[PDB]
């Protein structure tokens, strides 16, 4: 019901090449620039007023690191995404009140960042694998909402 055996390998291989801190910071930064309404959740983060400032904001970088770190961990359990993110799913619903649509926007921004950073190497079939993954993670994060 999610992610073929072979697509798992493209995921694993590309991710071995990823500086998670770098990517996480870049992807959260872009979410907030490209879809500025997502800023509603980071009022305490400081200067978010322009693209520069968002990308250079240390709290955005910090958090992007945390978020994508959790994403990274989940890649080790591609066959049990719901169970893996159930704790964070309820946190995001009960404590943080984050519309799960945001996980889908971030997924698409991350896909763009992978593509921008890896270039030719982010091939159509590798993108396909990662689309399934981000969809799966978003779905898993949305799963305990009520």
């Amino acid at each position: 019901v999610h992610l073929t055996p072979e697509e798992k390998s493209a995921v694993t291989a590309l991710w071995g090449k990823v500086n998670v801190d770098e990517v996480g910071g870049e992807a959260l930064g872009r979410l907030l620039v490209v879809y500025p309404w997502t800023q509603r959740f980071f009022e305490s983060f400081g200067d978010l007023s322009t693209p520069d400032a968002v990308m250079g904001n240390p709290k955005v970088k910090a958090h992007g690191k945390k978020v994508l770190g959790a994403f990274s961990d989940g890649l080790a359990h591609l066959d049990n995404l719901k169970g893996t993110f159930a704790t964070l799913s309820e946190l995001h619903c009960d404590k943080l009140h984050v519309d799960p649509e945001n996980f889908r926007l971030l997924g698409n921004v991350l896909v763009c960042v992978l593509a921008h950073h890896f270039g030719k190497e982010f091939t159509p079939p590798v993108q396909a694998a990662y689309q399934k993954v981000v969809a799966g993670v978003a779905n898993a994060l949305a799963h305990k909402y009520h």
Binding site: W37, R40, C93, H97, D99, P100, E101, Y145, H146
Partner: protein
């Protein structure tokens, strides 16, 4: 775009809700919160209990804003100008949620105005709600 027939159908169907503005808006909101729980992430500061004064109040504010838009159907960007400002820069509700509320408003109207809710009016009201949502999200970025 809304056609003149569209504008005729909307004015007719909505003038019909009339005084039930507040009742229908609140019902629509409740249908939404129940059918589409993710939408509650925007109202953690409301008592979302059936019959809550908070939801009843918001329902009326939604209906009244819709009454306004119908009243200025030719000139909706301007008539809703402050509301789109509010949603763009402060509330910041993700655009996907407007389709969910719009849907529940359609369902509410169908359940209350069986005589008025013809296929043609159903289509016009769907386009109308969509155009309101578009106006309300036009300033997001």
């Amino acid at each position: 775009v809304l056609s003149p027939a569209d504008k005729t159908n909307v004015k007719a169907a909505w003038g019909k809700v009339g005084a039930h503005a507040g009742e229908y808006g609140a019902e629509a909101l409740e249908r939404m919160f129940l059918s589409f729980p993710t939408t509650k992430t925007y109202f953690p500061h409301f008592d979302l209990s059936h019959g809550s004064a908070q939801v009843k109040g918001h329902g009326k504010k939604v209906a009244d804003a819709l009454t306004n838009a119908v009243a200025h159907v030719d000139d909706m960007p301007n008539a809703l100008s402050a509301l789109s400002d509010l949603h763009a820069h402060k509330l910041r509700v993700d655009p996907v949620n407007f389709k969910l509320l719009s849907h529940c408003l359609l369902v509410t109207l169908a359940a209350h105005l069986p005589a008025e809710f013809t296929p043609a009016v159903h289509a016009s009201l769907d386009k109308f709600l969509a155009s309101v949502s578009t106006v309300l999200t036009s300033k997001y970025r």
